């Protein structure tokens, strides 16, 4: 069959694609909601989704390291799909310069808050998961 090795490789990549398609088409949706409804109020919609994605993928770094072997499929759709669609580096970058071009204390507060908080979310996730069943 027209090079079986390549047929099977491509079909596998197609499963692994379908995976990311679904994971990301949900992860993005969630962020769209939180941003549109909670950016009108240091915009917290695009910050809520970043903190949440940090927490999830930080729960799953300790998970897919001490609890692997179950499937790569769901790993991929949960990491580089859900936590990529829910997260963003761009919508956070726009508002920083939207504070810069306007004129510098909250443009640096955006930087610091975003980075340190979405990191402490990864910390929360990792230590929650590893402590849960240590």
């Amino acid at each position, epitope marked *: *069959l027209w*090079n*079986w*090795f390549d047929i*099977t*490789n491509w*079909l*596998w990549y197609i*499963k692994s694609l379908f995976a990311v398609i679904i994971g990301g088409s949900v992860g993005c949706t969630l962020r769209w909601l939180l941003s549109t409804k909670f950016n009108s109020l240091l915009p917290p919609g695009t910050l809520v989704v970043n903190l949440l994605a940090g927490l999830i993928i930080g729960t799953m770094l300790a998970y897919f390291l001490r609890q692997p072997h179950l499937d790569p499929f769901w790993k991929l759709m949960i990491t580089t799909g859900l936590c990529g669609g829910l997260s963003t580096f761009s919508t956070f970058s726009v508002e920083v310069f939207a504070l810069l071009q306007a004129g510098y204390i909250w443009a640096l507060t955006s930087v610091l808050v975003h980075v340190i908080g979405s990191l402490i979310m990864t910390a929360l996730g990792f230590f929650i998961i590893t402590i849960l069943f240590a």
Partner: antibody
Framework: EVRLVESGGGLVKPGGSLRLSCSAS????????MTWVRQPPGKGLEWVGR??????????DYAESVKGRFTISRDNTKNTLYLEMNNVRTEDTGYYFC??????????????????????WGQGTLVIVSS | SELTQDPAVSVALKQTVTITCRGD??????ASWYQKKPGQAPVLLFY???NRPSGIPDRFSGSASGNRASLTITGAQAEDEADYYC????????????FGGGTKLTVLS
């Protein structure tokens, strides 16, 4: 219908050479993946090697204990499979079976390169290797 | 032998027995089960997710999990007293195929 007959086994001293042949019939031979499998006397089956089909460029993969010493080939016109055994070790004693090799890959659970199976077998051919 | 079986196992007549093969590749690839009587050729019995080729009675059924696979014989018969071999890849992602040690089934008759 589907028939596979091996031929050309027998006695041969260590270091010799021999050609086992598999006459194939009753299916599209020109495209079927083919596999050799030998059973030493009082042992289990051991996959020897497998030549691919037309889509793969007639690639052949060999069991490690055999790689470098055995050569698989095919005449799609004469409809026969060939195993050339050169520089023999007494290990290679046993019956030798050619098998039509189905290919399998379930789309959702799969992992390349799938997994091959052996639907149709010959009856064997005995190669003895002793001084 | 990355594929590992228990060498011998028996069962009484009309009962049910299961041969279990184990190995790394078994987690990422399916298997194929072959019956083998002395002198007689190997007989494909099952492979993949749920493929039982035509002719093989309904009583033969393959199974797969974690790193193990298993052939299930339901309703033992004296004409099943044979050798049984699993077959899969040697490692995950190889074109090289490999058989297990084999399992000697006695049908206590």
């Amino acid at each position: 219908e589907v028939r596979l007959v091996e031929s050309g086994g027998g006695l041969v001293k260590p270091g010799g050479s021999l050609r086992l042949s598999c006459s194939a019939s009753g299916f599209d031979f020109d495209n079927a993946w083919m596999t050799w499998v030998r059973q030493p006397p009082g042992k289990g089956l051991e996959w020897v090697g497998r030549i691919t089909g037309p889509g793969e460029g007639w690639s052949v993969d060999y069991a490690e204990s055999v790689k470098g010493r055995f050569t698989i080939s095919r005449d799609n016109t004469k409809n026969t499979l060939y195993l050339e055994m050169n520089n023999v070790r007494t290990e290679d004693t046993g019956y030798y079976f050619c098998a039509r090799t189905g290919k399998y890959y379930d789309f959702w659970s799969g992992y390349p390169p799938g997994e091959e199976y052996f639907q149709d077998w010959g009856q064997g051919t005995l190669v003895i290797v002793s001084s | 032998s990355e594929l590992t079986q228990d060498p011998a196992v028996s069962v009484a007549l009309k009962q049910t027995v299961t041969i279990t093969c184990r190995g790394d590749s078994l987690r990422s690839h399916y298997a194929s089960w072959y019956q083998k009587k002395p002198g007689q050729a190997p007989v494909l019995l099952f492979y993949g997710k749920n493929n039982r080729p035509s002719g093989i009675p309904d009583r033969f059924s393959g199974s797969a999990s974690g790193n193990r696979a298993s052939l299930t014989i339901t309703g033992a018969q004296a004409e099943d007293e044979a050798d049984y071999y699993c077959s899969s890849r040697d490692k995950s992602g190889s074109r090289l195929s490999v058989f297990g040690g084999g399992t000697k089934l006695t049908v206590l008759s």
